[PDB]
Amino acid sequence: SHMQSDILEMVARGWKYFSGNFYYFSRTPKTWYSAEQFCISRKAHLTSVSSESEQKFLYKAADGIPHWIGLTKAGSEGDWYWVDQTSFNKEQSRRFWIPGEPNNNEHCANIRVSALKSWNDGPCDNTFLFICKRPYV
Amino acid sequence: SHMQSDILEMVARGWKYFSGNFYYFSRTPKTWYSAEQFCISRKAHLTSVSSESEQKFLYKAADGIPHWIGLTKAGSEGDWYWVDQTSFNKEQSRRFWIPGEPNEHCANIRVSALKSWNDGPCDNTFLFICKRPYVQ
Ligand SMILES: [Cl-]
Ligand SMILES: [Cl-]
Ligand SMILES: [Cl-]
């Protein structure tokens, strides 16, 4: 009810509700850095992917169009991490990377196929649609 | 004791220490967005400016070279604000904008003078300045 009217407010602002989080699928493309700053300006972050269930929601909604998510590599030689400061599960990510990815500039992940294995490692300065997440509180 | 080794640890990473804060003057240019994400990765933000003495420290060190700072407005129409969420003192700012000033809007320091802030497109590539408070 109060959750229901909060959902209605966010839906009118372009957000989708799923499993206790709000998601913003953008209408225009941005670099990974600019998209993260846009999500911050919306009290959000580029989305993390914490479960197979969340990955399935994201890839279906992304509809085979590249969408930035919030995983980035600390330069070409670092580990991958989530900008929202949840801990990255690199072992499960073997179920999410497109085979052969990360291909290994600056390195940023985007969802680009309508399958479970959908993450691509792409140059962070490419301009793609993007996906913010903000937990419902 | 630990205070001097704390300061020396950041200085050895390439930060300047000035009056209670660490500053990172970058070696490579970036867009404003990429510079802010770099500062975040170092537990920092693009610098705010909250006094005359801080403004003077920054413009002297910037040496007339454009440097991003942490002031922005969302679209040509929002109010200006500091990304580190400190309060923006509009009245004080009038002593820091270049005379005449102020799609994407981001401030950079670009003159070796007190009046040195420029309103520039966020997708320009400039050197930048991070700030991290010293907490003991
Ligand atoms: Cl958008
Ligand atoms: Cl950018
Ligand atoms: Cl640098």
Numbering used by the authors:
A (entry chain B): 188 to 291, 295 to 327
B (entry chain A): 188 to 289, 295 to 328
Provide the publication's sentences verbatim.
Langerin, a member of the C-type lectin (CTL) superfamily, is a Ca2+-dependent carbohydrate-binding protein. This receptor is primarily expressed on Langerhans cells, antigen-presenting cells residing in the epidermis of the skin, where it plays a crucial role in various biological processes, in particular, in initiating the innate immune response. The canonical carbohydrate-binding site of CTLs features a long loop where the EPN (Glu-Pro-Asn) motif, responsible for its mannose specificity, is located. The recognition of the cofactor Ca2+ by langerin is tightly coupled to its life cycle as an endocytic and recycling receptor.
To further elucidate the structural basis of Ca2+ competition, we conducted X-ray crystallographic studies. The central proline in the EPN motif is crucial for the Ca2+ coordination. In this structure, Pro289 remains in the cis conformation while the long loop shows significant mobility, as indicated by the missing electron density, similar to the inhibitor-bound structure. This observation is consistent with previous NMR results showing 75 ± 10% of the central proline adopts the cis conformation in Ca2+-free human langerin. The pronounced long loop conformational differences between Ca2+-bound and unbound states highlight the sensitivity of the long loop to Ca2+. (D) Superposition of the four chains from both structures highlights marked differences in the long loop conformation, with only minor variability in the short loop. A similar mechanism has been described for another CTL, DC-SIGNR, where the loop adjacent to its secondary Ca2+ site shifts between open and closed states depending on Ca2+ binding. Therefore, it remains unclear whether the long loop structural rearrangement upon inhibitor binding is driven either by an induced fit mechanism, conformational selection, or a combination of both. X-ray crystallography revealed the binding site of inhibitor 3 and the long loop sensitivity toward Ca2+. The results highlight the long loop as a potential structural switch and offer a design strategy of future langerin and other CTL inhibitors.
